[PDB]
Amino acid sequence: KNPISPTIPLDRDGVFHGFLKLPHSRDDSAWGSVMIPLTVIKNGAGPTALLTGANHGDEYEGPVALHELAATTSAEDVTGRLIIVPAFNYPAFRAGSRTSPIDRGNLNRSFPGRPDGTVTEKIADYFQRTLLPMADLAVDFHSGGKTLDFVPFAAAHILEDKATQAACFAAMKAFNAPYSVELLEIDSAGMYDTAVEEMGKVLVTTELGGGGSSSARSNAIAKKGLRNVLIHAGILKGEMQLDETVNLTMPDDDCFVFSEGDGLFEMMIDLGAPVAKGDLLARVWPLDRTGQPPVEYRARRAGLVISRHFPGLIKSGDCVAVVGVT
Numbered sequence: 001k002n003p004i005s006p007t008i009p010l011d012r013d014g015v016f017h018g019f020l021k022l023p024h025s026r027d028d029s030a031w032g033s034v035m036i037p038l039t040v041i042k043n044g045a046g047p048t049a050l051l052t053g054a055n056h057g058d059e060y061e062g063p064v065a066l067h068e069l070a071a072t073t074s075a076e077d078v079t080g081r082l083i084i085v086p087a088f089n090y091p092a093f094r095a096g097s098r099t100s101p102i103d104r105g106n107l108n109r110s111f112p113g114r115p116d117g118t119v120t121e122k123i124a125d126y127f128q129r130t131l132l133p134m135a136d137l138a139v140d141f142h143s144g145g146k147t148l149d150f151v152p153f154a155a156a157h158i159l160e161d162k163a164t165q166a167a168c169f170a171a172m173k174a175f176n177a178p179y180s181v182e183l184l185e186i187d188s189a190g191m192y193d194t195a196v197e198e199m200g201k202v203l204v205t206t207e208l209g210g211g212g213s214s215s216a217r218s219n220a221i222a223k224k225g226l227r228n229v230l231i232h233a234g235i236l237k238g239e240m241q242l243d244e245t246v247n248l249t250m251p252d253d254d255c256f257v258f259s260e261g262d263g264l265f266e267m268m269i270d271l272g273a274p275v276a277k278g279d280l281l282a283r284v285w286p287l288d289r290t291g292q293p294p295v296e297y298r299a300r301r302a303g304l305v306i307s308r309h310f311p312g313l314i315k316s317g318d319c320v321a322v323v324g325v326t
């Protein structure tokens with residue numbers, strides 16, 4: 001029995017604004033709670049979509065779209081059910097950080113979680129055992145965060161069940177981000193991705209920009225894809241917006257480049273720009289001194305720069321850049 005209990009019904013017709021109340025006894029509140037905001041919109045019979053933003057706290061395109069959806073959608077617009085959680089790892093979202101300030105918990109590495117663990121593990125357990133079985137479709141928004149920046153794209157995994165792999169790709173096509181990706185997310189343990197997919201459910205995941213900020217273009221991409229995906233699922237009516245998309249893959253480790261030293265980061269080729277094998281991706285300047293040649297990082301695969309280290313300061317082990325193919 002997970003101690004979380006909603007403040008609103010999850011199975012009644014109408015529009016509900018309430019919270020997932022997670023008890024949390026702590027120094028600044030002895031009988032306190034984490035009040036995870038959520039909106040349930042239900043109307044008649046139909047599929048149920050579980051919509052999450054801010055799985056990592058410092059990623060904002062999702063929470064912006066889900067807040068708008070929770071505030072501008074009437075029950076009559078829906079055939080089915082929307083479960084809307086704009087801030088998924090809510091303590092991290094309130095702290096403005098990828099991980100939670102309470103337990104340093106990475107929510108996207110905490111599944112299946114446990115009902116008696118950390119605050120983050122209790123969140124993961126509740127979606128693992130209570131919310132996901134209620135859902136047919138799961139849209140889990142992601143962006144680069146303060147340390148990464150991505151080309152705006154929706155992704156689907158090469159997974160072993162080809163039936164629900166096909167369903168995931170169909171929803172990615174419906175999302176219609178400017179780029180479309182099959183992510184090399186090996187290192188697959190503990191993710192919400194893996195929880196949804198292993199249940200045979202439909203998963204939509206994204207990487208919409210980054211840097212700890214969202215733009216009007218990037219907010220719009222999140223709003224379009226969300227609307228398309230809900231129409232594609234049968235929950236919302238209307239005409240889908242179909243624009244051009246570029247298909248990209250990550251077949252290899254050599255799509256990735258990590259830095260081996262700290263310094264001042266100079267990106268030499270912008271996001272989304274084409275790159276050939278061996279082209280100079282970035283150079284890192286010394287923090288300590290002047291007049292020394294920069295440390296050069298070169299592409300090991302041709303394609304497009306789909307991700308880059310965001311901050312001006314880079315550390316050893318940070319991912320300099322990622323190349324997407326075609």
Ligand SMILES: *NCC[C@H](N)C(=O)O
Pocket residue numbers: 056108142143144148183184185
């Ligand atoms: N490969 C999955 C995306 C990653 N966990 C992130 O940067 O959010």
Ligand SMILES: [Zn+2]
Pocket residue numbers: 056059142143144145
């Ligand atoms: Zn993320």
